[PDB]
Short mmCIF file of all heavy atoms in Angstrom, two decimals:
data_model
loop_
_atom_site.label_atom_id
_atom_site.label_comp_id
_atom_site.label_asym_id
_atom_site.label_seq_id
_atom_site.Cartn_x
_atom_site.Cartn_y
_atom_site.Cartn_z
N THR C 37 -31.58 50.18 51.41
CA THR C 37 -32.55 49.63 50.47
C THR C 37 -31.86 48.70 49.47
O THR C 37 -30.70 48.88 49.11
CB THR C 37 -33.29 50.74 49.74
OG1 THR C 37 -32.34 51.61 49.11
CG2 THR C 37 -34.16 51.54 50.71
N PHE C 38 -32.60 47.70 49.04
CA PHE C 38 -32.10 46.72 48.10
C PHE C 38 -32.03 47.33 46.70
O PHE C 38 -33.00 47.95 46.25
CB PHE C 38 -33.02 45.51 48.09
CG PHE C 38 -32.52 44.37 47.25
CD1 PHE C 38 -31.61 43.46 47.77
CD2 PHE C 38 -32.95 44.22 45.94
CE1 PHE C 38 -31.16 42.40 47.00
CE2 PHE C 38 -32.49 43.17 45.17
CZ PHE C 38 -31.59 42.27 45.69
N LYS C 39 -30.89 47.16 46.05
CA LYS C 39 -30.67 47.60 44.68
C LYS C 39 -30.85 46.41 43.75
O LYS C 39 -30.09 45.44 43.83
CB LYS C 39 -29.25 48.14 44.56
CG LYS C 39 -28.81 48.52 43.15
CD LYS C 39 -29.48 49.77 42.67
CE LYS C 39 -28.83 50.28 41.40
NZ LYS C 39 -29.51 51.51 40.97
N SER C 40 -31.84 46.50 42.87
CA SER C 40 -32.08 45.45 41.89
C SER C 40 -31.14 45.64 40.72
O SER C 40 -31.20 46.66 40.03
CB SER C 40 -33.54 45.47 41.43
OG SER C 40 -34.39 45.16 42.52
N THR C 41 -30.26 44.67 40.52
CA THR C 41 -29.26 44.72 39.47
C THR C 41 -28.72 43.32 39.28
O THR C 41 -28.49 42.61 40.26
CB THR C 41 -28.14 45.72 39.81
OG1 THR C 41 -27.21 45.79 38.73
CG2 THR C 41 -27.40 45.33 41.08
N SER C 42 -28.54 42.90 38.03
CA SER C 42 -28.06 41.56 37.75
C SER C 42 -26.55 41.48 37.93
O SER C 42 -25.81 42.27 37.34
CB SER C 42 -28.40 41.16 36.32
OG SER C 42 -29.80 41.04 36.15
N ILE C 43 -26.09 40.52 38.73
CA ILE C 43 -24.67 40.30 38.99
C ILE C 43 -24.37 38.85 38.65
O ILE C 43 -24.70 37.94 39.42
CB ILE C 43 -24.28 40.62 40.43
CG1 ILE C 43 -24.68 42.06 40.77
CG2 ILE C 43 -22.79 40.39 40.62
CD1 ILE C 43 -24.54 42.42 42.22
N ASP C 44 -23.74 38.61 37.50
CA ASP C 44 -23.33 37.28 37.10
C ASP C 44 -22.07 36.89 37.86
O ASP C 44 -21.12 37.66 37.93
CB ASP C 44 -23.04 37.29 35.60
CG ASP C 44 -22.65 35.94 35.07
OD1 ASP C 44 -21.50 35.51 35.32
OD2 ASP C 44 -23.48 35.30 34.39
N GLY C 45 -22.05 35.69 38.44
CA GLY C 45 -20.85 35.27 39.14
C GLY C 45 -20.89 33.78 39.39
O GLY C 45 -21.83 33.10 39.01
N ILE C 46 -19.85 33.26 40.06
CA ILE C 46 -19.71 31.82 40.27
C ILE C 46 -19.77 31.50 41.76
O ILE C 46 -19.29 32.26 42.60
CB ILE C 46 -18.45 31.25 39.61
CG1 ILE C 46 -17.18 31.80 40.27
CG2 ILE C 46 -18.46 31.56 38.12
CD1 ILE C 46 -15.93 31.06 39.87
N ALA C 47 -20.39 30.37 42.09
CA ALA C 47 -20.40 29.85 43.45
C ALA C 47 -19.13 29.02 43.61
O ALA C 47 -19.00 27.94 42.99
CB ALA C 47 -21.66 29.03 43.69
N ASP C 48 -18.18 29.52 44.40
CA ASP C 48 -16.82 28.98 44.44
C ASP C 48 -16.36 28.76 45.88
O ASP C 48 -15.85 29.67 46.53
CB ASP C 48 -15.87 29.93 43.72
CG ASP C 48 -14.46 29.39 43.61
OD1 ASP C 48 -14.20 28.26 44.11
OD2 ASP C 48 -13.60 30.09 43.02
N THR C 49 -16.50 27.52 46.35
CA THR C 49 -16.09 27.20 47.71
C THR C 49 -14.58 27.29 47.88
O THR C 49 -14.10 27.34 49.02
CB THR C 49 -16.56 25.80 48.10
OG1 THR C 49 -16.00 24.85 47.19
CG2 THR C 49 -18.09 25.70 48.14
N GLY C 50 -13.82 27.26 46.79
CA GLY C 50 -12.38 27.33 46.86
C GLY C 50 -11.79 28.72 46.89
O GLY C 50 -10.57 28.87 46.93
N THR C 51 -12.63 29.75 46.87
CA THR C 51 -12.18 31.13 46.99
C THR C 51 -12.66 31.66 48.33
O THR C 51 -13.81 31.43 48.71
CB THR C 51 -12.74 31.98 45.84
OG1 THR C 51 -12.08 31.61 44.64
CG2 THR C 51 -12.52 33.48 46.08
N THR C 52 -11.76 32.34 49.06
CA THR C 52 -12.07 32.76 50.42
C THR C 52 -13.11 33.87 50.45
O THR C 52 -14.04 33.85 51.27
CB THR C 52 -10.80 33.23 51.12
OG1 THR C 52 -9.73 32.30 50.92
CG2 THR C 52 -11.04 33.43 52.62
N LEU C 53 -12.91 34.89 49.63
CA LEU C 53 -13.63 36.15 49.75
C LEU C 53 -14.74 36.29 48.71
O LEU C 53 -14.96 35.42 47.86
CB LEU C 53 -12.64 37.32 49.64
CG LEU C 53 -11.46 37.27 50.61
CD1 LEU C 53 -10.66 38.55 50.49
CD2 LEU C 53 -11.90 37.07 52.06
N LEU C 54 -15.48 37.39 48.84
CA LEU C 54 -16.56 37.75 47.93
C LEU C 54 -16.06 38.84 47.00
O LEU C 54 -15.71 39.93 47.45
CB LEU C 54 -17.76 38.24 48.74
CG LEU C 54 -18.97 38.83 48.01
CD1 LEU C 54 -19.49 37.88 46.94
CD2 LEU C 54 -20.06 39.16 49.00
N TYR C 55 -15.97 38.54 45.70
CA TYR C 55 -15.44 39.46 44.70
C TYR C 55 -16.58 39.94 43.82
O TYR C 55 -17.21 39.12 43.13
CB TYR C 55 -14.36 38.80 43.85
CG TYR C 55 -13.12 38.48 44.65
CD1 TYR C 55 -13.00 37.28 45.31
CD2 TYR C 55 -12.08 39.39 44.75
CE1 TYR C 55 -11.88 36.96 46.06
CE2 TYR C 55 -10.94 39.08 45.49
CZ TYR C 55 -10.86 37.87 46.16
OH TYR C 55 -9.75 37.55 46.91
N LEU C 56 -16.85 41.24 43.83
CA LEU C 56 -18.01 41.83 43.15
C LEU C 56 -17.60 43.07 42.38
O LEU C 56 -16.48 43.56 42.53
CB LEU C 56 -19.07 42.18 44.20
CG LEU C 56 -19.74 40.98 44.86
CD1 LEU C 56 -20.64 41.48 45.96
CD2 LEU C 56 -20.54 40.16 43.86
N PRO C 57 -18.47 43.60 41.53
CA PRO C 57 -18.08 44.76 40.71
C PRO C 57 -17.67 45.95 41.57
O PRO C 57 -18.15 46.13 42.69
CB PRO C 57 -19.35 45.06 39.90
CG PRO C 57 -20.05 43.74 39.81
CD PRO C 57 -19.81 43.10 41.15
N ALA C 58 -16.79 46.79 41.01
CA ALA C 58 -16.21 47.88 41.79
C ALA C 58 -17.26 48.84 42.31
O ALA C 58 -17.09 49.42 43.39
CB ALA C 58 -15.21 48.66 40.94
N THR C 59 -18.35 49.04 41.55
CA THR C 59 -19.43 49.91 42.01
C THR C 59 -20.05 49.38 43.29
O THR C 59 -20.29 50.13 44.24
CB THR C 59 -20.49 50.00 40.93
OG1 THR C 59 -20.81 48.67 40.53
CG2 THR C 59 -20.02 50.82 39.72
N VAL C 60 -20.32 48.08 43.33
CA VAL C 60 -20.94 47.43 44.49
C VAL C 60 -20.01 47.51 45.70
O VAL C 60 -20.44 47.82 46.82
CB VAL C 60 -21.29 45.97 44.15
CG1 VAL C 60 -21.90 45.24 45.33
CG2 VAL C 60 -22.20 45.92 42.95
N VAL C 61 -18.74 47.18 45.49
CA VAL C 61 -17.77 47.14 46.57
C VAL C 61 -17.53 48.54 47.14
O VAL C 61 -17.40 48.73 48.35
CB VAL C 61 -16.49 46.46 46.06
CG1 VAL C 61 -15.38 46.45 47.10
CG2 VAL C 61 -16.84 45.06 45.60
N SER C 62 -17.50 49.55 46.27
CA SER C 62 -17.35 50.93 46.74
C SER C 62 -18.54 51.34 47.60
O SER C 62 -18.37 51.97 48.65
CB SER C 62 -17.21 51.86 45.54
OG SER C 62 -16.98 53.20 45.93
N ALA C 63 -19.76 50.98 47.17
CA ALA C 63 -20.94 51.30 47.97
C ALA C 63 -20.89 50.64 49.34
O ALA C 63 -21.35 51.22 50.33
CB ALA C 63 -22.22 50.90 47.22
N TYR C 64 -20.36 49.41 49.41
CA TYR C 64 -20.24 48.75 50.72
C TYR C 64 -19.25 49.49 51.62
O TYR C 64 -19.59 49.91 52.74
CB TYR C 64 -19.86 47.27 50.55
CG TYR C 64 -19.68 46.61 51.91
CD1 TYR C 64 -20.78 46.17 52.64
CD2 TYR C 64 -18.43 46.50 52.51
CE1 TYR C 64 -20.62 45.63 53.90
CE2 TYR C 64 -18.26 45.98 53.77
CZ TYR C 64 -19.36 45.54 54.47
OH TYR C 64 -19.17 45.04 55.74
N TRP C 65 -18.01 49.68 51.15
CA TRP C 65 -16.96 50.22 52.01
C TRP C 65 -17.16 51.69 52.33
O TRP C 65 -16.65 52.16 53.35
CB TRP C 65 -15.56 49.94 51.42
CG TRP C 65 -15.23 48.49 51.53
CD1 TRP C 65 -15.16 47.58 50.51
CD2 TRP C 65 -15.01 47.76 52.73
NE1 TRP C 65 -14.90 46.32 51.01
CE2 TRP C 65 -14.81 46.41 52.37
CE3 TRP C 65 -14.97 48.10 54.08
CZ2 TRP C 65 -14.57 45.42 53.32
CZ3 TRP C 65 -14.72 47.11 55.02
CH2 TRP C 65 -14.53 45.79 54.63
N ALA C 66 -17.96 52.40 51.54
CA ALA C 66 -18.29 53.77 51.87
C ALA C 66 -19.08 53.87 53.16
O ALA C 66 -19.17 54.97 53.73
CB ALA C 66 -19.06 54.38 50.71
N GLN C 67 -19.67 52.77 53.64
CA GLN C 67 -20.40 52.79 54.90
C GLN C 67 -19.53 52.51 56.11
O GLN C 67 -20.05 52.46 57.24
CB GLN C 67 -21.57 51.81 54.82
CG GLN C 67 -22.60 52.22 53.77
CD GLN C 67 -23.10 53.64 53.95
OE1 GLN C 67 -23.52 54.01 55.05
NE2 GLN C 67 -23.04 54.45 52.89
N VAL C 68 -18.22 52.35 55.92
CA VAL C 68 -17.29 52.01 56.99
C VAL C 68 -16.32 53.17 57.11
O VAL C 68 -15.51 53.40 56.21
CB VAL C 68 -16.56 50.70 56.68
CG1 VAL C 68 -15.56 50.37 57.81
CG2 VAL C 68 -17.54 49.56 56.45
N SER C 69 -16.36 53.88 58.24
CA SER C 69 -15.49 55.03 58.43
C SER C 69 -14.04 54.60 58.37
O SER C 69 -13.62 53.68 59.08
CB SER C 69 -15.77 55.68 59.78
OG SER C 69 -17.01 56.36 59.77
N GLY C 70 -13.26 55.27 57.52
CA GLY C 70 -11.85 55.02 57.41
C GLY C 70 -11.47 53.91 56.46
O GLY C 70 -10.28 53.65 56.26
N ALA C 71 -12.45 53.24 55.86
CA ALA C 71 -12.10 52.20 54.90
C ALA C 71 -11.57 52.83 53.62
O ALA C 71 -12.00 53.90 53.20
CB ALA C 71 -13.32 51.34 54.61
N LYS C 72 -10.63 52.13 52.99
CA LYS C 72 -10.03 52.64 51.76
C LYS C 72 -9.48 51.47 50.97
O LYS C 72 -9.18 50.42 51.53
CB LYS C 72 -8.90 53.63 52.06
CG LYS C 72 -7.70 53.01 52.74
CD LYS C 72 -6.63 54.07 53.06
N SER C 73 -9.35 51.66 49.66
CA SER C 73 -8.67 50.69 48.83
C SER C 73 -7.18 51.02 48.83
O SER C 73 -6.79 52.15 48.52
CB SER C 73 -9.20 50.72 47.39
OG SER C 73 -8.58 49.72 46.61
N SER C 74 -6.37 50.03 49.18
CA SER C 74 -4.93 50.18 49.28
C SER C 74 -4.26 49.38 48.17
O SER C 74 -4.31 48.15 48.17
CB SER C 74 -4.46 49.71 50.65
OG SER C 74 -3.06 49.55 50.65
N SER C 75 -3.60 50.07 47.24
CA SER C 75 -2.86 49.37 46.21
C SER C 75 -1.69 48.59 46.79
O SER C 75 -1.35 47.51 46.30
CB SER C 75 -2.36 50.36 45.15
OG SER C 75 -1.61 51.40 45.75
N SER C 76 -1.07 49.10 47.86
CA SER C 76 0.07 48.40 48.44
C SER C 76 -0.35 47.12 49.14
O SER C 76 0.38 46.13 49.10
CB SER C 76 0.82 49.32 49.40
OG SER C 76 0.01 49.70 50.49
N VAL C 77 -1.52 47.11 49.78
CA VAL C 77 -1.98 45.90 50.42
C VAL C 77 -2.66 44.97 49.42
O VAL C 77 -2.57 43.75 49.55
CB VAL C 77 -2.90 46.25 51.60
CG1 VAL C 77 -3.51 45.00 52.20
CG2 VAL C 77 -2.13 47.04 52.65
N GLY C 78 -3.32 45.52 48.41
CA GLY C 78 -3.99 44.73 47.41
C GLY C 78 -5.49 44.64 47.57
O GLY C 78 -6.08 43.63 47.15
N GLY C 79 -6.13 45.65 48.15
CA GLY C 79 -7.57 45.69 48.23
C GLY C 79 -8.03 46.64 49.33
O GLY C 79 -7.25 47.42 49.88
N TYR C 80 -9.31 46.52 49.64
CA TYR C 80 -9.91 47.35 50.67
C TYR C 80 -9.46 46.89 52.04
O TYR C 80 -9.48 45.69 52.36
CB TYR C 80 -11.43 47.29 50.56
CG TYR C 80 -11.99 48.20 49.50
CD1 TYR C 80 -12.16 47.78 48.19
CD2 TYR C 80 -12.36 49.50 49.82
CE1 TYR C 80 -12.69 48.62 47.23
CE2 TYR C 80 -12.88 50.35 48.87
CZ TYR C 80 -13.05 49.90 47.58
OH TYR C 80 -13.58 50.73 46.62
N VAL C 81 -9.09 47.88 52.86
CA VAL C 81 -8.73 47.70 54.25
C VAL C 81 -9.62 48.64 55.05
O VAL C 81 -10.20 49.59 54.51
CB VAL C 81 -7.25 48.01 54.50
CG1 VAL C 81 -6.38 47.02 53.73
CG2 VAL C 81 -6.91 49.44 54.08
N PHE C 82 -9.71 48.38 56.34
CA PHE C 82 -10.58 49.17 57.20
C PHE C 82 -10.01 49.16 58.61
O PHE C 82 -9.24 48.26 58.98
CB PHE C 82 -12.02 48.63 57.17
CG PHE C 82 -12.17 47.28 57.80
CD1 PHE C 82 -12.53 47.18 59.12
CD2 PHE C 82 -11.94 46.12 57.07
CE1 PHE C 82 -12.66 45.94 59.71
CE2 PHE C 82 -12.04 44.90 57.67
CZ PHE C 82 -12.41 44.80 58.99
#
C-alpha cells in the first residue's frame, strides 16, 4: 500500500542512485531476503 508522506528532495541527473530517508530505505530492503546495510561496503547490499 502507498504511504502518504512528504519527502523533500532534488531531481539530480548527476547522481546515480536514489537516496531517501532511512525509514523509507529500511522498509524497502526489508522486503528482500538477506538484504542488509553493510558499513564496510557503504550501504545496503543484497
Side-chain angles (χ1 to χ4, degrees), residues 37-71 73-82:
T37 55
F38 186 84
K39 174 73 168 180
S40 295
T41 183
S42 293
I43 304 171
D44 182 286
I46 66 168
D48 185 0
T49 59
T51 289
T52 313
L53 306 186
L54 173 54
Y55 293 89
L56 291 174
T59 50
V60 179
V61 177
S62 183
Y64 178 81
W65 289 109
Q67 296 306 309
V68 179
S69 287
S73 183
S74 166
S75 55
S76 63
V77 174
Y80 279 89
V81 296
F82 67 94

